[PDB]
Amino acid sequence: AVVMTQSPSTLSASVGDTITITCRASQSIETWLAWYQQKPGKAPKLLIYKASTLKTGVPSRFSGSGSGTEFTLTISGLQFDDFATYHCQHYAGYSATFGQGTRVEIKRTVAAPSVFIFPPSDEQLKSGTASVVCLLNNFYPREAKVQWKVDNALQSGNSQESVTEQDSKDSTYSLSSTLTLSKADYEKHKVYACEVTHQGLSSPVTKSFNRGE
Amino acid sequence: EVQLVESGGGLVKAGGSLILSCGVSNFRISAHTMNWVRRVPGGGLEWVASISTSSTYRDYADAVKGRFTVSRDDLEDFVYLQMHKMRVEDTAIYYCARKGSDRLSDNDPFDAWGPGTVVTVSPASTKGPSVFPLAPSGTAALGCLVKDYFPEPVTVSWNSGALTSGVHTFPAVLQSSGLYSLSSVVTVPSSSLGTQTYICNVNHKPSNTKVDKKVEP
Ligand SMILES: OC[C@@]1(O)OC[C@@H](O)[C@@H](O)[C@@H]1O
């Protein structure tokens, strides 16, 4: 089956730059290739099809080239509206297949996360649940890892995370991780710790507290 | 040997949508008008929808007309029921039923029935969040945890909008309970803490709910 390999996975650039994104097919696909733009929480938008034909309304700064197995999308003079994910697709008579997408983001210097941990409030704890919150503030690039440890036990399967879009003033990301336990489980351990890893840190950073002061 | 099996079915909030399907064994549906019927908690049956051969005619009970759609797939032998803008009184066991059998005349009873799938519609279309402070302790962080509301969205300002710098309000996360949760945080000079009061203003329009929580060390 055709496999599409899209490079790079993330592309960091400044406004005004000309950038290229590529897609290689595992086997010849003539020019049966489309490029889509996608912003978070929105539908994909078709930009280019048959490798190089622009859809009506698409700005002329977008262009596509290639045939056979190698394809390129070029944006000549990036604008703020263009920071988004781009997807290539081989489309065939019955099926289709996508590359893994390329996230185009605004470039800035590496920033390690500033890390903060928050205990559950007594009020919430009285209701039978403990939410422990870890904040990773103002970091770049977007990849980070949070691990929770309770009394030094690596936890699994009991946290959820969310991440902001790049900050409009400083182009950083922030991330929140929440560890959720029952009051019974919460009150059986003392040390709660959020442990963070990011390329901007030379070692993991841990923030903790002892349950109840 | 002939059988029908409903799938989909579960818990729905009032106002929500849910789609059911019905697969069959040991007969083909093409020659039959297919039907959905439900049994309400008081015990009676209510005819819901009918779809005739080749989808020539689709008919609905008055109570569901305009909110429900029945479709059929003769090549793979399925029947569908879309239910939209659901109401408490849609709560019922839903069955698909075949009209006619090997005995196939111009008007037959419901000769074969599936075992039913349970659909429950909860009366609250919405629910306001609980807000919990995210208590602080160069620069300090604090924030508000906005828990267990539905549906999206919730809005968080700070000190009634005066404070905007250093604020991050995260995307809501859907909890395995079916309720949304988000956090909003802000970093402030840590020297400002034993002075300056911080209040998150949490607004949830769907439930007409406004909560102001003072976050302090
Ligand atoms: O609904 C009318 C009818 O003629 O449609 C085809 C078969 O379902 C018959 O059993 C049924 O009586």
What residues make up the domain containing B79? 1-123
User: Is A51 within 8 Å of A102 (Cβ atoms)?
Assistant: no
Kindly state whether residues B13 and B94 are assigned to the same domain.
yes
User: How many whole angstroms separate alpha carbon B149 and alpha carbon B153?
Assistant: 9
Which is the closest atom of ligand 1 to the Cα of B105?
A: 12
Q: Within 13 Å of residue B105, how many CA atoms lie on the same side as its CB?
A: 6
From A118, A127, A160, residue closest to B135, measured CB to CB = A118
> What DSSP string describes B2-25?
-EEEEE---EEETT--EEEEEEEE
Kindly state whether residues B83 and B148 are assigned to the same domain.
no
Nearest to B198 by CA among B171, B166, B154: B166
The residues, ordered by sequence, that sit 6+ positions from B87 with a Cβ below 8 Å of its Cβ are B14, B121
Pocket of ligand 1 (CB under 6 A): B 32-33, 52-53, 99-100, 104-108
Kindly state whether residues B193 and B104 are assigned to the same domain.
no
φ, ψ at B55 (rounded to 5°): 55, 30
> How long is chain B?
217
* Tokens matching residue A168: 């409009």
The CATH number assigned to the domain holding B210 equals: 2.60.40.10
Kindly state whether residues B20 and B67 are assigned to the same domain.
yes
User: How many whole angstroms separate alpha carbon A24 and alpha carbon A7?
Assistant: 9
Kindly state whether residues B103 and B22 are assigned to the same domain.
yes
User: Is B206 within 8 Å of B180 (Cβ atoms)?
Assistant: no
Q: A114: distance to nearest CA of chain B, Å? A: 10
Q: A173: distance to nearest CA of chain B, Å? A: 10
Asked if B185 has any chain A CB less than 8 Å from its own CB, the reply is: yes
Cα-to-centroid distance, B67 and ligand 1 (Å):
25
Query: Which technique?
Result: X-ray
How far from B77 is each of B5, B69, B165, CA to CA, in Å? Answer: 11, 17, 59
Q: Which residue has the tokens 């015990």?
A: B43
User: Is B31 within 8 Å of B141 (Cβ atoms)?
Assistant: no
Domains and CATH numbers, chain A: 1-107 (2.60.40.10), 108-211 (2.60.40.10)
Kindly state whether residues B8 and B100 are assigned to the same domain.
yes
* Tokens matching residue B131: 């807000």
B73, B90, B123 — which closes off a domain?
Answer: B123
Kindly state whether residues B98 and B134 are assigned to the same domain.
no
B71, B95, B123 — which closes off a domain?
Answer: B123
Kindly state whether residues B155 and B117 are assigned to the same domain.
no
φ, ψ at A143 (rounded to 5°): -75, 125
B72, B93, B123 — which closes off a domain?
Answer: B123
Kindly state whether residues B81 and B167 are assigned to the same domain.
no
For residue A127, give the H/E element and its range.
helix A122-127
User: How many whole angstroms separate alpha carbon B1 and alpha carbon B4?
Assistant: 10
Asked if B139 has any chain A CB less than 8 Å from its own CB, the reply is: yes
* Distance of alpha carbon B89 from the chain centroid: 15
* Tokens matching residue A196: 């963070």
The type of residue at B79 is V
Which is the closest atom of ligand 1 to the Cα of B111?
A: 10
Mutation test residue for ligand 1: of B30, B104, B110, B111, the one with most atoms within 8 Å of CB: B104
Structural domains in chain B (count): 2
Which is the closest atom of ligand 1 to the Cα of B34?
A: 8
Kindly state whether residues B8 and B103 are assigned to the same domain.
yes
